[PDB]
Every structure is written in structure tokens, then in C-alpha cells.
Amino acid sequence: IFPKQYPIINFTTAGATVQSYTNFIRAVRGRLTTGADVRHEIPVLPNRVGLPINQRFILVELSNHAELSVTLALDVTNAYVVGYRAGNSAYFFHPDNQEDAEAITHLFTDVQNRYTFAFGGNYDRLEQLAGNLRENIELGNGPLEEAISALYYYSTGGTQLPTLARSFIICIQMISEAARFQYIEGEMRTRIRYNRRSAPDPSVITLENSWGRLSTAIQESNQGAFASPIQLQRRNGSKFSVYDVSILIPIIALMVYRCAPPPSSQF
Ligand SMILES: Nc1nc2cc[nH]c2c(=O)[nH]1
Numbered sequence: 001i002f003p004k005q006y007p008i009i010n011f012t013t014a015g016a017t018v019q020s021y022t023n024f025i026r027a028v029r030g031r032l033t034t035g036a037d038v039r040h041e042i043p044v045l046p047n048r049v050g051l052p053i054n055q056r057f058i059l060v061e062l063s064n065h066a067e068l069s070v071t072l073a074l075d076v077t078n079a080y081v082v083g084y085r086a087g088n089s090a091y092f093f094h095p096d097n098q099e100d101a102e103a104i105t106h107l108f109t110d111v112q113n114r115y116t117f118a119f120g121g122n123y124d125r126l127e128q129l130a131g132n133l134r135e136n137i138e139l140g141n142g143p144l145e146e147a148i149s150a151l152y153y154y155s156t157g158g159t160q161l162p163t164l165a166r167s168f169i170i171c172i173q174m175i176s177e178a179a180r181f182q183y184i185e186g187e188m189r190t191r192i193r194y195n196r197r198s199a200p201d202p203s204v205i206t207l208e209n210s211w212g213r214l215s216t217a218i219q220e221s222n223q224g225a226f227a228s229p230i231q232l233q234r235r236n237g238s239k240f241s242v243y244d245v246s247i248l249i250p251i252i253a254l255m256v257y258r259c260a261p262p263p264s265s266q267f
Contacts, residue, residue, distance in 0.1 A: 002109050006057045007031050013145040014065040018189050028179045029253060031058045032076055036266060039219050039255065040245045047257045048077040053106055057082070060175060064148045072171060073107050078256045079176040081121060081168065082107070086155040089113040093121030113155075121168065123208075129165035134173070134205055139188065140197030143170050173200065177208050182253045184208075206233035207251075215255035218245050 009031060011024045033043040046055070060072040071085040073092075082104060083092030090108040094117050095101040108114070119125050127133050137143075147167035154164050178185045187204055191197065207214075210232065217226050229241040242248060 002106075004054055006054075006059050008059040008061055008071075010061040010063070012063040012065070013141055013148065014063070016141050016192060018193050021189060021192055022185075025178050025185050028058070028060070028074070028079075028175065032074070032079060032179065033254060037261060037264075039261075040221070040224055041249060042218065042245075042252060042255055044215075044219075044255050044257055045077050045079070051077065053103055056103055057107060062144075062148050062171070064145055064152070066149075068148055068152045070148050070151045071108075072175070074176065079179055079254065081172050081176055083121075084151055085111060086152045089115065089155040091154070092116045094118055096120065123169070123172075126165045126169050130162050130169060132162075132166060134169060134208075135199050135202075137166055137169055138197045138199050139170060139173055140191040141195070142197045144174050147171050173204075173208070177204075180211055180254050181207050181251060183251045185253075201235050202233040202237040203235045211252075212256060214248065214252060216258045218248070218252075218255060219259040221245055 009024065009027050011020075032045060034046060035043070037044045048056075056076055058074040058076055060074055062070045062072065069086075073082045073084065074080070075082050081093075082095075082100075083090060085091075085108045088111050090111045090113070092104050092107065092115070095104055104116075119129065123134065130137070147170040150158065150160070150163045150167040151171070173184070174188055178188050184204055184207065187200070210230070213230060217228075217230055220227060224245045226243055226245070229243055231239050231241050233239055
């Protein structure tokens, strides 16, 4: 066995409800952030520069309403889905650097088959493969159910890259993005609430694209005041500017490490 297995969080699309979903998201958030290091009341993700391999990844066990199981590997430093496991085969996205590649080799070391995609796992690449943009890809418990099915069957011959990519895009938003933004969590919650399945509107997309920007601004903000007005998008697509972190507090839940903690008065 591998010395100390990474924490595993489970979820199932079977009898999934708003409650179970909320629990899942809160659990993920709790495993990502150590609780400590919060800038302007918002918790920050662990700094990779000094983060040991053992406390680098979080496993997410996704099960279908038809005995299908798949396990995603979440990068604790940015809630980035690095890869997944199905049956006895592990698939990882092409790393952007040797450092991460070195870390990736520690995932699912007990599988018989390991494969590394030539393409990256970032939205821009995935959308090209899926032949569909996020704004045209539906989200919800249903789509998620189908997503798990595709991912699992990839290791058996189903393959179909367009579908495979689409599945990833779905899982990422419903898990990673949901844990990142309390707002996105709500969107998914409403969808599950009414057994709905719909594509994400502008406001959601913009947030996903601006996660890094926001994290930076909030950390380099003079006591909450942003150094420059950040433009965001509304549900109808209309743009608006944000000047203070206060407005974003109930929206964003987690931020990626950017600036080094100043006098850390952690009390
Ligand atoms: N792999 C991957 N993970 C995440 C997590 C948030 N956004 C993304 C993304 O675009 N790709």
C-alpha cells in the first residue's frame, strides 16, 4: 500500500439532493483549505512552493446510479482536476511543467495502466475537443450522471474524445468551480433542486475565467479596496465593475495563493 493515502471524498448521483450536494461541496472545501490563512475573511489555498507531496492531492469518488465508479484527482493548491481513475487505468492531463509531472506520478500508483493525455486539461483545449463551448454544454445532476458514465467507459473502449472532453468540462464546473465560488454552488443547487439541466450563463463563465484575477486583486488590495476596478458580467451578459472585496465575500469561497502573507495576525 502507498504510505498514507490521500483523503477521499465520496458522492453519488443516485438519490442526490440539494442537501447531499451541499455536504459534498462543504467537505471538498474543508479538505482543500487548512482553515488557516484567510485574506479579508476569505480562505486561501495552500502554497505549492513549500507544500509536501503527501498533502498535495485530494481524491473525489464519483459514483453513478448504475454501479459505475470514477475517481478524480483534485490539486489542493488550485482545485485543478489533474486526472482520474477508472477500473484499473489512470488518465492524467498533460502537465505544464516537470515539477507538477513529478507530483502526478504519485497518483493512483496501484493501477495496472497509466496514461497521460497529450493535450492539456484547461477549458480552451477541452472545448476544442468537445466541439462545444461551456455556454452550450448543460449542467445538472443528469449531465453529471452521464459524465461519470463516459469517463468510466473510456477505459473500456467507449473513448470518443469529444464526449470525454465534454464530461470533464461538466465535472470540473460542478465540483472544482462549485467549491471555488459559493455562487456557482448555488447555481448547481437550483438545477438539482428542480431536476433541471441547463448551460451556464455569462455571470458563471466570467467568474470561472476571473478566478485568478480576483484572487490576485483581493490579496494585493489595500485593506479591501481594489487597486483597479475589476469588470464582471451579469446573468444577461451586461458588464459591471467591482471596487471592493466586500461585495465578493458572499460570492467567492476560495482563492489561489498569490501574495505572501503580511503580518499574519492569525487569531
Ligand atoms: N483541469 C481543470 N481543472 C480546473 C479547475 C477549475 N478550472 C479548471 C480547468 O479548466 N481545468
